[PDB]
Amino acid sequence: TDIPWAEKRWTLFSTVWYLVQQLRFVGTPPALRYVAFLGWRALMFQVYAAHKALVLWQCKLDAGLARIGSGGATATFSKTMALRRLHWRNSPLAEALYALNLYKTGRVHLLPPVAKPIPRPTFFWLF
Amino acid sequence: WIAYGFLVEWSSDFITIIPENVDIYIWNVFSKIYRTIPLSFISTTLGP
């Protein structure tokens, strides 16, 4: 009932992509879809554990860069920024700006703005 | 006897004296047979 009209656009790319979705849903057996779904679930759990470890290491790097830049006083790290990295709410520019900010003035609890969601790209009748 | 024995069948439109059950059965058999055609075509053409 609340489909955005940008997702109901008919284009050449969506015409091609209907074939992929049709082969996925009515062209491939649900048994093979189920075993592929289980494999993708296990792989996504593994990559989530990897991303969580990477975020914890980025917290340690946050503390290191916050010491080199404020001398030795500020050595903590922003837990809100840790959750922001974990929830993918940060742009790479925001990450670089925050890291540089730590490295040369400290200020752990001064955070970059949250990145807006990326809108769906549209190019006329192409996509 | 010919009434029951091949007159009311030979003189009637065969759309009338044919259940929709056999049409549904033949369509189901056909659609079950030719169901792997997209995946098999993709596997043949995307192979070596």
Ligand SMILES: CCCCCCCCCCCCCCCCCC(=O)OC[C@H](CO[C@@H]1O[C@H](CO[C@H]2O[C@H](CO)[C@H](O)[C@H](O)[C@H]2O)[C@H](O)[C@H](O)[C@H]1O)OC(=O)CCCCCCCCCCCCCCCCC
């Ligand atoms: C206990 C049972 C023993 C086996 C069970 C587990 C062992 C092995 C699991 C499968 C093999 C390895 C899978 C790893 C990657 C997944 C493959 C894939 O591309 O990804 C598959 C995706 C994932 O499933 C769907 O995926 C959807 C879309 O998400 C993802 O979809 C894609 C994932 O490829 C993209 O990555 C995309 O970015 C991402 O969003 C949903 O999110 C859900 O996760 C789910 O509905 O499916 C799809 O779209 C495609 C549908 C058809 C593809 C079939 C591929 C493999 C089929 C094996 C059949 C052999 C039978 C014998 C059994 C032994 C198994 C080897």
